[PDB]
């Protein structure tokens, strides 16, 4: 989410995906395995945070007939302290989880980019804005071979090396 200067608001099929533009036509297909990876990780975070406690706390005050003022001040003091502790823990928890979530998504995007980069050894060159320049017109069947990680890295080498 850095050098990719933006997101595709039109990509409604998944989180990550491609958008190819060769001589045959246009293309925008979502990548299911990376999107499912990030979705699985966030889902795990939700499964860990959304939790039910089996610890039962009993009534220690009395809303209808106030208890002794001293023990009531001790009870209010302790309750306020615990409330401060849990407010701190909640704030820090949410902030940290959000940080690791954003960095997690960015990491998945970068690792995908490096995956496609390693698929295209010398037949393509990095553009600098998250795109790959292909020195030979890759048709739609070749694009589908790139998506499902079946593009041959040597049976298109010499043609692109000449260009």
């Amino acid at each position: 989410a850095g050098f990719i200067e933006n997101g595709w608001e039109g990509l409604i099929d998944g989180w990550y995906g491609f958008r190819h533009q060769n001589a045959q036509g246009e293309g925008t297909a979502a990548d299911y395995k990376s999107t499912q990876s990030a979705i699985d990780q966030i889902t795990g975070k939700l499964n860990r945070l959304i939790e039910k406690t089996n610890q039962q706390f009993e009534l220690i005050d009395n809303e209808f007939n106030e208890v002794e003022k001293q023990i009531g001040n001790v009870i209010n003091w302790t309750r306020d302290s615990i409330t401060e502790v849990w407010s701190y823990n909640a704030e820090l928890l949410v902030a940290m989880e959000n940080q690791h979530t954003i960095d997690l998504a960015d990491s998945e995007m970068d690792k995908l980019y490096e995956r496609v980069k390693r698929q295209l050894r010398e037949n393509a060159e990095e553009d600098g804005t998250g795109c790959f320049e292909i020195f030979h017109k890759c048709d739609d069947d070749c694009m589908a071979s790139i998506r499902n990680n079946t593009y041959d890295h040597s049976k298109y080498r010499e043609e692109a090396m000449q260009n």
Partner: protein, 314 residues
Amino acid sequence: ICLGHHAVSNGTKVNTLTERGVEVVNATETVERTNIPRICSKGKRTVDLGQCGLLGTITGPPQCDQFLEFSADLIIERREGSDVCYPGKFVNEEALRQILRESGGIDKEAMGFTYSGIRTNGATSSCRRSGSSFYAEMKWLLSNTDNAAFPQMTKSYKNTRKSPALIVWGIHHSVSTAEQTKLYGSGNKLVTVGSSNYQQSFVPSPGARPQVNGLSGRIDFHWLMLNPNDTVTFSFNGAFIAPDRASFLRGKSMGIQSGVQVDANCEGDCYHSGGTIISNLPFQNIDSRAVGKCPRYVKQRSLLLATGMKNVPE
């Protein structure tokens, strides 16, 4: 071939370790604020005390006649409840309340007290049933005639059951010393309760009090907990409300104070005075004094957790 990520036109701002207001794709709430304004009691034995006070279930005023041997997993106290019919008060009342809230109900047993040379049918106009009555679990001990004296008495009770027994007695405080001489006779009166963990010590204090229910007399209610096979003993010579039946804790329960209705259609383990908190979120900003199995109370009303990636639109 260009690859990238998705984005939306309207995201959700969240807070992180670094910034404040980072617009992400999707986010969910972690601090619960929705409250059900009812006492969700689906699947629990519930006893709504109503006009009966929790402590009254041990002494038995007219409003607690149907709560002398209750059994519940959830005990609800109401604001209109009253522990007494004759104007009185409990010593160590809140500790006894907390004991009875998690008792799972109470089981009464006749203590087997018989008397010789004294009256026993003391009553009043405030504890009204058919006519003028008294506490169902207590007996107002007086002198036989309209004055006379009170013989120094010693009555003993042994807990023959495997669970601790709740013993509650009462000291009387008339409107004056003359009325005390009328009920129990002249002279200094003294009440002594002793056991293995207890050791008192009781003397009356007659005097004029503000008229509650048209009565200026008061009754001090005291209580101890006998251990199994432990024996308690009373030595009294007047101004003594004798216990007729002892109490035994049934099992386990929870006690709450509320003012909303009971609903057997919803289920919940987190209760407060305004209703039930039904949520899976780890935190809540509804009531810091919520009891049961609750999310931990926090002061923040909202803490948005990021469930999506960073939203960077065009």
